[PDB]
Amino acid sequence: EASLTGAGATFPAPVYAKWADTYQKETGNKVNYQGIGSSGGVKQIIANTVDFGASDAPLSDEKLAQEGLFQFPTVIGGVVLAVNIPGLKSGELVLDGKTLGDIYLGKIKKWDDEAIAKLNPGLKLPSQNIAVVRRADGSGTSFVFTSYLAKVNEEWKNNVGTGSTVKWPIGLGGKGNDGIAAFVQRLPGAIGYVEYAYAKQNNLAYTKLISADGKPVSPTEENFANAAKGADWSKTFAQDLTNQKGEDAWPITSTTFILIHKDQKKPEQGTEVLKFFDWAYKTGAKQANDLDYASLPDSVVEQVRAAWKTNIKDSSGKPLY
């Protein structure tokens, strides 16, 4: 029976928490996961205060090597725009990238703005102020979201850019995915970006989005998976899943990563971390798919296992997988 600690990304926290509960039921091993955001995850694994870190934003090969870290992906999720719009039901509103960016720039202030009406010609839109919500904490969901906005809105690209933290033009700060979900629930007229489970499991309305190919798409597990079908995983785990081509490709998709040290000073901890995630790849798909996370292809799992064997060792050089 091991007691493991992880910290970081809230984007996959629902699935990690479910996996950890199940794992403990089945094996007795205990995994404590703190959802503090990706930036904090990276800080804590570098600091050696947890057995594993978690970040939705990948570290570069060079950064990993500088820090003695190894990164591997776990699941594929999607970022949606949770909304609180009087008189509309979930999934009714469509936004495109440009107009979403104009909302986040503060250029569009009301939900019946002409640019929104044009995207939604059959819909009766209220004269409700838009209450923009964004992350307060250093966030991989923010990194994915702003990566997307930079592709689709040039003004955003040039003035705000991409980051886990940026200088938000407008918008109230929510802590974690959970914090944004709570703000959207409490604020008539809100819009906030969250990983899909945080909308669905909180019964929040959400929008459709226009795909890179120009078609309205609903956020679903399958459509997150579709956004990754063009990914050449063999080349790198650090795949960009935003604004990808193809049918039914949800435009704000991302994988998410676990970070561990290559030289495990507590090798039994490291061994057990790998056993937990290996169990999750082998047995955890229904739990992920229940929470609308798409699973990595088997070939990717096999890449991860091969890489564990060559990268994760004790201080004497012995592999821990």
Side-chain angles (χ1 to χ4, degrees):
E1 182 201 271
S3 283
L4 305 177
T5 60
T10 69
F11 171 119
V15 63
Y16 294 171
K18 185 51 179 191
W19 281 349
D21 185 65
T22 304
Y23 192 61
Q24 187 175 156
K25 290 172 181 170
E26 289 182 19
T27 73
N29 295 304
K30 302 171 174 181
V31 177
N32 178 285
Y33 184 74
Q34 295 302 128
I36 65 173
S38 290
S39 300
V42 175
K43 176 174 169 0
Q44 294 198 4
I45 192 59
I46 289 174
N48 235 227
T49 61
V50 289
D51 299 306
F52 66 91
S55 178
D56 318 305
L59 284 56
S60 71
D61 294 335
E62 177 183 20
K63 182 67 170 173
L64 291 169
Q66 289 174 345
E67 298 294 344
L69 296 171
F70 175 75
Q71 154 177 281
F72 58 98
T74 56
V75 296
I76 301 162
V79 182
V80 306
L81 288 304
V83 295
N84 187 337
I85 303 169
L88 248 37
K89 62 199 140 86
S90 185
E92 284 199 316
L93 194 77
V94 182
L95 295 169
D96 68 8
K98 167 62 163 54
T99 299
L100 180 60
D102 288 344
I103 293 165
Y104 271 80
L105 285 164
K107 293 170 57 74
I108 296 175
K109 293 164 192 89
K110 295 189 163 269
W111 281 107
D112 66 347
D113 189 278
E114 61 90 0
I116 303 174
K118 23 153 280 292
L119 290 160
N120 294 273
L123 258 192
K124 309 277 115 250
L125 299 170
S127 300
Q128 180 73 228
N129 300 162
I130 302 181
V132 175
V133 186
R134 53 76 184 178
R135 292 288 283 280
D137 57 316
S139 165
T141 307
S142 293
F143 183 84
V144 173
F145 185 68
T146 65
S147 289
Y148 173 73
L149 292 184
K151 293 181 175 189
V152 298
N153 185 299
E154 287 208 63
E155 181 172 0
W156 184 279
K157 177 183 184 185
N158 287 335
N159 290 280
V160 186
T162 78
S164 294
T165 298
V166 299
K167 186 189 183 317
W168 297 92
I170 196 155
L172 301 184
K175 183 180 178 48
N177 272 287
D178 49 4
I180 293 194
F183 252 122
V184 172
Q185 181 54 52
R186 71 178 184 88
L187 296 179
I191 180 169
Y193 57 92
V194 295
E195 199 285 328
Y196 182 63
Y198 292 87
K200 180 175 170 179
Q201 304 303 328
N202 290 304
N203 300 303
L204 294 178
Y206 57 81
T207 82
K208 297 183 186 175
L209 289 177
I210 300 300
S211 70
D213 289 350
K215 297 188 175 357
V217 59
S218 292
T220 73
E221 182 172 331
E222 298 89 331
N223 294 348
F224 309 148
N226 286 335
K229 279 182 164 60
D232 196 4
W233 297 108
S234 70
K235 291 191 61 134
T236 178
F237 296 142
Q239 292 292 326
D240 178 0
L241 306 176
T242 71
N243 217 35
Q244 299 296 301
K245 296 168 171 170
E247 283 272 79
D248 289 321
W250 180 250
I252 322 181
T253 298
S254 185
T255 190
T256 186
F257 304 89
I258 299 297
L259 291 163
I260 55 174
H261 289 274
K262 289 185 291 181
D263 180 359
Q264 286 281 319
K265 305 309 195 127
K266 292 185 177 179
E268 44 312 304
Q269 296 299 95
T271 298
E272 294 284 357
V273 170
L274 303 183
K275 288 180 168 162
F276 170 57
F277 285 104
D278 201 27
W279 169 95
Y281 291 136
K282 284 176 183 175
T283 77
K286 177 175 191 300
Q287 292 153 264
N289 315 146
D290 282 352
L291 288 160
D292 302 289
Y293 298 89
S295 296
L296 295 169
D298 289 346
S299 64
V300 185
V301 176
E302 293 301 321
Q303 288 177 259
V304 172
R305 288 178 177 135
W308 285 341
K309 295 187 172 291
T310 64
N311 284 272
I312 312 303
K313 295 176 184 174
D314 67 21
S315 63
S316 296
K318 185 179 68 156
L320 304 178
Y321 190 82

